Amino acid sequence: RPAFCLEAPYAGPGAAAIIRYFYNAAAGAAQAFVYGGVAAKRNNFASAADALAACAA
């Protein structure tokens, strides 16, 4: 899969509490996490569907 999909989710430094999805290769599933609203990495999607389409080849 895309290497970015293997990275840990990144909340980043922002003050917001936004629910986003990362692909968790360990679980083989998309999972919610809290994103702070700034400096997203690529393993960070609006929905489980978007995460699987990008990362679950």
Residue numbers in the entry: 1001 to 1057
Please share text taken word for word from the publication where this structure appeared.
Here, we report a structural and thermodynamic analysis of six extensively simplified BPTI variants, where 19–24 of its 58 residues are alanines, using differential scanning calorimetry (DSC) and X-ray crystallography. We used a stabilized BPTI- (BPTI- A14GA38V12), containing only the 5–55 disulfide bond, as the reference molecule instead of wild-type BPTI, which contains three disulfide bonds13, and a BPTI variant containing 19 alanines (BPTI-19A) as the template for further simplification. However, the alanine substitutions exerted a small unexpected enthalpy stabilization, and the magnitude of which increased in a nearly additive fashion along with the number of alanine substitutions, which was, however, over-compensated with entropy destabilization. A structural analysis indicated that new water molecules were recruited into the spaces created by the alanine substitutions, facilitating protein–water hydrogen-bonded interactions as well as interactions with the methyl group and creating hydration networks around the substitution sites.
